[PDB]
A paper describes a structure:
We examined the structures of large inserts in the FlgE sequence by solving the structures of FlgE from Caulobacter crescentus (C. crescentus) and C. jejuni. Both FlgEcc32 and FlgEcj79 contain completely different extra domains that are not present in FlgE from Salmonella enterica.
Domain D2 consists of β-strands organized like a rugby ball, that is completed with some long loops. Domain D2 has a loop that protrudes away from it, while Domain D3 consists of a single segment, Ala184-Lys328. Similarly, domains D2 of FlgEcc32 and FlgEst superimpose with an RMSD of 1.7 Å, and domains D2 of FlgEcc32 and FlgEcj79 superimpose with an RMSD of 0.9 Å. The relative positions of domains D2 and D3 of FlgEcc32 need to be slightly rearranged to obtain a relatively good docking given the low-resolution of the map.
Author numbering: 167 to 469
């Protein structure tokens, strides 16, 4: 029965972001938006890039997305937008000129320089005069760790998002059978940043259909060394996951405590025991690295 795994693999640092993670509005070979006039009567052509936050939407009643505004491949403005999850209206924007401080968002504009020149969000398609404000970002069908994920893709290849890289982790269960756990990852929009999911085979868990175990944002140093794993392993130390026994029922909580989301639980049919597994991504000889070389699994150690 597997209790500890060591992942030895490299993720190529120059791996380009997938369109499903960072979506440029419009057709290939032409700017997203043309002849956008700023408050100083100057016209621009802009690229508009919506990016997934890597954090499950909705957040406090809103669908949140990252936004970059680019001119000739240079970011002139950036921030986060939040659309009402029910009504699809823009609710808040932190889009401001790049490097701005303090960040000063607007429901109708963004600054494009420190001098305070602005453009209209509507001319960028971030707001919609003839429909739902979120129409153009919704068209991008962006990654979501909860509703449009790599685990969704594993279950149905027409759904969710295909990973940039995967590490398969074979577990021996309490019966000696082999359960495959997979670490699925996407290059994130941030520097040295990746979106990650841990997942069992779809159907191997009783508590969902796609087999997702956990999700998290993984960060690397500028030198390609693992920096942190976000909430991928929760707050465990050492980093670990626990998959509950077949037939495990979480007791009803006593109400200062709140009922935790149903934890990963082995399918009834498997009839196997709780499996707590340390997952070591930072060993001295190996570990999960992010150098500019081929994405590759060097080896996976198990006990």
């Amino acid at each position: 029965k597997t209790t500890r795994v060591g992942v030895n693999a490299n993720l190529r640092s120059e791996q380009p972001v997938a369109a499903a993670v960072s979506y440029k509005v419009g057709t290939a070979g032409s700017p997203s938006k043309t002849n956008v006039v700023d408050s100083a009567t100057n016209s621009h052509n802009y690229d508009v890039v919506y990016s997934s936050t890597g954090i499950a939407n909705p957040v406090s009643g809103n669908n949140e997305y990252l936004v970059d505004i680019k001119e000739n491949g240079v970011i002139v403005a950036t921030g986060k937008v939040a659309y009402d999850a029910a009504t699809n209206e823009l609710v808040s924007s932190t889009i401001d000129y790049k490097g701005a401080s303090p960040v000063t968002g607007s429901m109708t504009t963004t600054r494009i320089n420190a001098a305070g020149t602005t453009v209209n969000l509507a001319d960028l398609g971030i707001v919609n005069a003839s429909g739902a404000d979120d129409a153009e970002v919704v068209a991008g069908k962006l990654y979501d760790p909860s509703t449009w994920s790599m685990s969704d893709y594993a279950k149905d290849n027409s759904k969710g998002v295909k990973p940039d890289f995967e590490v398969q982790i074979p577990l021996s269960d309490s019966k000696g059978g082999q359960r495959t756990v997979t670490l699925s990852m996407l290059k994130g929009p941030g520097p040295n940043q990746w979106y990650a999911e841990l997942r069992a085979k779809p159907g191997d868990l009783a508590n969902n259909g796609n087999g997702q175990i956990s999700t998290g944002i993984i960060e690397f140093t500028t030198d390609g060394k693992l920096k942190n794993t976000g909430s991928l392993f929760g707050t465990t130390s050492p980093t670990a996951i626990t998959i509950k026994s077949s037939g495990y029922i979480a007791p009803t909580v006593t109400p200062p405590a709140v009922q935790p989301p149903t934890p990963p639980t082995w399918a009834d049919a498997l009839g196997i025991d709780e499996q707590e597994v340390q997952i070591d991504l930072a060993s001295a000889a190996g570990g999960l690295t992010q150098y500019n070389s081929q994405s590759v699994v060097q080896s996976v150690n198990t006990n």
